[PDB]
């Protein structure tokens, strides 16, 4: 129902300012505010949003409060001043969801029949992209339970829009543009090796959760099947790529030919002007 | 008729002789089976076209498949022998739109027809598919792990 | 095959008498054509080199 | 293409280099975008040739 999102950072800063509005007062749990959107294709876009007050006691996670009158009033405001927008969901600032969130979702899926949430983090350090998307559909179950209404993790990204970075890249000021040729590749090496194989090792920690625990949905439906998509390469010892060392030599082939020829021509670049201007400066210096 | 056309899988010519030669004696309609098979001066040319059908029934799926099989094994899975293979496959290599591969050298053939002009789609398929599935592995395996620790 | 050509090289033991080739290899060609003239440019700078010192 | 087609006009000017220091007037550099474009190009694509050993074992 949702293909992916195209989410601008402006709405994230529009979360940040209301986070500032709640960091100064008695903060019980978190922020629940409105997420407007510009839904055009099965892809999604958001240009703007606003918040709504919210409190929640924790006794039966059912005591939680919005103001639909205020919501539809400021929706009428921003709909009049901009007829492109409409509501598309909500957001929350606490990075881990909880069981009240389905009640939030289905209670605001009455205006438009879809309401995608947005996890964010006001103090992000370890995550990748803040923007996250769920959708509430049913697969019902293998055991076909009475309405196993599940959030379904839709893919996400940070969006892009022309000249919205006019403030941004002027503000941050620290950007080393076009570090191709230096150390960006090894930053990606450190982070993708370590920070992806730790995702892998926490997947195998979840496998240890399946060992000592994990009766719950032990999930022999999607786990080993997408892991069989991984297991397209069962890379055991003896390494099994006698039929790929020549292909690796073919990979080395053209680039090393370019390296040999071209860097010989690069020495040929440097030496000419270097010698000529060198002895020019040297014996015409006096 | 339709089973001879859905994925096609092989065929035996004599089982076709059974199934579609007991129809030339069994009568409900009798005139089209006469005009196509029971006739001789044109119906036997349509029997020749049926032989075209059984051999193209071979050649279509064997152009879809069979990378590194031999040749006498090929002819006995063609249900038509090696001289019949040169006849029945010369008259469809004159179709000259299917590229296949045979060698002799003692009577042994091989395959993999384009001679592999690829180091490109290896990288494409292998690395782009696997790396993007691995960046999905985070986004949905830690999602389901966080789900199974929502329900714990 | 002697006089004319279609890249039809002879093999007495294949069957197909294999015609295969790779025409675009101009990557090395145009660079070799460059180096041919670049050595001449180095030679024609050697006069300035050997003359301006002594 | 983008390298060699610019490289032949990069190497034209030593035909016209000479002596009598100010008696010639056309100083322009020629090494531009054939040091650095080739540097970034070939080093990133040889690390792309390293991707198979980095990902695969």
Swiss-Prot record, chain A:
UniProt crosslink position (Glycyl lysine isopeptide (Lys-Gly) (interchain with G-Cter in ubiquitin)): 176
Domain MPN: 5-140
Family (UniProt): Belongs to the peptidase M67A family.
GO biological process assignments: proteasome-mediated ubiquitin-dependent protein catabolic process
Name of the protein this chain belongs to: 26S proteasome non-ATPase regulatory subunit 7
GO molecular function terms listed in the Swiss-Prot or TrEMBL record: protein homodimerization activity
InterPro entries xrefs: EIF3F/CSN6-like_C, JAMM/MPN+_dom, MPN, MPN_RPN7_8
GO CC entries: cytosol; extracellular exosome; extracellular region; ficolin-1-rich granule lumen; membrane; nucleoplasm; nucleus; proteasome complex
Modified sites of kind N6-acetyllysine: 200, 210
Curated annotation (Swiss-Prot), chain B:
Residues the record lists as N6-acetyllysine modifications: 64
Entry coiled-coil feature ranges: none
Domain of life: Eukaryota
Span of domain PCI: 1-116
Subunit structure of this chain's protein: Component of the 19S proteasome regulatory particle complex. The 26S proteasome consists of a 20S core particle (CP) and two 19S regulatory subunits (RP). The regulatory particle is made of a lid composed of 9 subunits including PSMD12, a base containing 6 ATPases and few additional components. Interacts with ERCC6.
Family indicated by similarity: Belongs to the proteasome subunit p55 family.
Disorder named in the UniProt entry: Stankiewicz-Isidor syndrome: A neurodevelopmental disorder characterized by delayed psychomotor development, intellectual disability, behavioral disorders, mild dysmorphism, ophthalmologic anomalies, feeding difficulties, deafness, and variable congenital malformations of the cardiac and/or urogenital systems.
Role description: Component of the 26S proteasome, a multiprotein complex involved in the ATP-dependent degradation of ubiquitinated proteins. This complex plays a key role in the maintenance of protein homeostasis by removing misfolded or damaged proteins, which could impair cellular functions, and by removing proteins whose functions are no longer required. Therefore, the proteasome participates in numerous cellular processes, including cell cycle progression, apoptosis, or DNA damage repair.
Protein name stated in the entry: 26S proteasome non-ATPase regulatory subunit 12
Organism in which the protein naturally occurs: Homo sapiens
From Swiss-Prot, chain C:
Tissue: Highly expressed in embryonic stem cells (ESCs). Expression decreases as ESCs differentiate.
Post-translational modification: Phosphorylated by AMPK.
Locations listed in the record: Nucleus; Cytoplasm, Cytosol
Induction line: By FOXO4; expression in embryonic stem cells (ESCs) is mediated by FOXO4.
Family membership: Belongs to the proteasome subunit S9 family.
Subunit structure: Component of the 19S proteasome regulatory particle complex. The 26S proteasome consists of a 20S core particle (CP) and two 19S regulatory subunits (RP). The regulatory particle is made of a lid composed of 9 subunits including PSMD11, a base containing 6 ATPases and few additional components.
Function per UniProt: Component of the 26S proteasome, a multiprotein complex involved in the ATP-dependent degradation of ubiquitinated proteins. This complex plays a key role in the maintenance of protein homeostasis by removing misfolded or damaged proteins, which could impair cellular functions, and by removing proteins whose functions are no longer required. Therefore, the proteasome participates in numerous cellular processes, including cell cycle progression, apoptosis, or DNA damage repair. In the complex, PSMD11 is required for proteasome assembly.
Identification of the protein by name: 26S proteasome non-ATPase regulatory subunit 11
Organism for this UniProt entry: Homo sapiens (Human)
Range of the intact protein held here: 369 to 422 of 422
Swiss-Prot record, chain D:
Tissue specificity field: Widely expressed. Highest levels in heart and skeletal muscle.
Residues carrying Phosphothreonine: 13
Function: Component of the 26S proteasome, a multiprotein complex involved in the ATP-dependent degradation of ubiquitinated proteins. This complex plays a key role in the maintenance of protein homeostasis by removing misfolded or damaged proteins, which could impair cellular functions, and by removing proteins whose functions are no longer required. Therefore, the proteasome participates in numerous cellular processes, including cell cycle progression, apoptosis, or DNA damage repair.
Subunit structure: Component of the 19S proteasome regulatory particle complex. The 26S proteasome consists of a 20S core particle (CP) and two 19S regulatory subunits (RP). The regulatory particle is made of a lid composed of 9 subunits including PSMD4, a base containing 6 ATPases and few additional components. Within the complex, PSMD4 interacts with subunit PSMD7 through their respective MPN domain. Interacts with TXNL1.
Similarity remark: Belongs to the peptidase M67A family. PSMD14 subfamily.
Protein name: 26S proteasome non-ATPase regulatory subunit 14
Gene encoding the protein: PSMD14
């Amino acid at each position: 129902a949702v293909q992916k999102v195209v989410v601008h950072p402006l709405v994230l800063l529009s979360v940040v300012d209301h986070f500032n509005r709640i960091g100064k007062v008695g903060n019980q749990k978190r922020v629940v505010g409105v997420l407007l959107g510009s839904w055009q294709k099965k892809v999604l876009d958001v240009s703007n949003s606003f918040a709504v007050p919210f409190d929640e006691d924790d006794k039966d996670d059912s005591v939680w409060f919005l103001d639909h009158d205020y919501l539809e009033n400021m929706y009428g405001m921003f709909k009049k001043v901009n007829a492109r927008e409409r509501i598309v969901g909500w957001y929350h600032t606490g990075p881990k969801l909880h069981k009240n969130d389905i009640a939030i979702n289905e209670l605001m899926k009455r205006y438009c029949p879809n309401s995608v949430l947005v996890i964010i983090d006001v103090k992000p350090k370890d995550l990748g992209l803040p923007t996250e998307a769920y959708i509430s559909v049913e697969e019902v179950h293998d055991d076909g339970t009475p309405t196993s209404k599940t959030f379904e993790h839709v893919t996400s990204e940070i969006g892009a829009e022309e000249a919205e970075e006019v403030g941004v890249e002027h503000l941050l000021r620290d950007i080393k543009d076009t570090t191709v040729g230096t150390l960006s590749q090894r930053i990606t090496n450190q982070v993708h090796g370590l920070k992806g194989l730790n995702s892998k090792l926490l997947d195998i920690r979840s496998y240890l959760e399946k060992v000592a625990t994990g009766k719950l949905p032990i999930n022999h439906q999607i786990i080993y099947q997408l892991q069989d998509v991984f297991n397209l390469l069962p890379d055991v010892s003896l390494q099994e790529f006698v039929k790929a060392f020549y292909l690796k030599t073919n990979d080395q082939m053209v680039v090393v030919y370019l390296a040999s020829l071209i860097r010989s021509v690069v020495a040929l670049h440097n030496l000419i002007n270097n010698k000529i201007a060198n002895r020019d400066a040297e014996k015409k210096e006096g | 008729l339709l089973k001879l056309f859905t994925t096609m899988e092989l065929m035996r010519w004599s089982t076709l002789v059974e199934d579609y030669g007991m129809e030339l004696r069994k009568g409900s309609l009798e005139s089209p089976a006469t005009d196509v098979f029971g006739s001789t001066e044109e119906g036997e040319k349509r029997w020749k076209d049926l032989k075209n059908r059984v051999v193209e029934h071979n050649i279509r799926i064997m152009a879809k498949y069979y990378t590194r099989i031999t040749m006498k094994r090929m002819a006995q899975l063609l249900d038509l022998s090696v001289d019949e293979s040169e006849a029945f496959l010369s008259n469809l290599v004159v179709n000259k739109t299917i590229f296949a591969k045979v060698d002799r050298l003692a009577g042994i053939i091989n395959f993999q027809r384009p001679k592999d002009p690829n180091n490109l789609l290896n990288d494409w398929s292998q690395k782009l598919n696997s790396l993007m599935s691995l960046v999905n592995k985070t986004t949905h395996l830690i999602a389901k792990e966080e789900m199974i620790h929502n329900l714990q | 095959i002697l006089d004319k050509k279609f890249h039809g090289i002879l093999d007495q033991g294949e069957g197909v008498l294999i015609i295969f080739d790779e025409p675009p290899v101009d990557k090395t060609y145009e660079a070799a054509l460059e180096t041919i003239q670049n050595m001449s440019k180095v030679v024609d700078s050697l006069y300035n080199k050997a003359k301006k010192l002594t | 293409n983008y390298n060699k087609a610019v490289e032949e006009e990069d190497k034209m000017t030593p035909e016209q280099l000479a002596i009598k220091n100010v008696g010639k007037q056309d100083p322009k550099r020629h090494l531009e975008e054939h040091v650095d474009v080739l540097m970034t190009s070939n080093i990133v694509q040889c690390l792309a040739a390293m991707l198979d050993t980095v990902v695969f074992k």
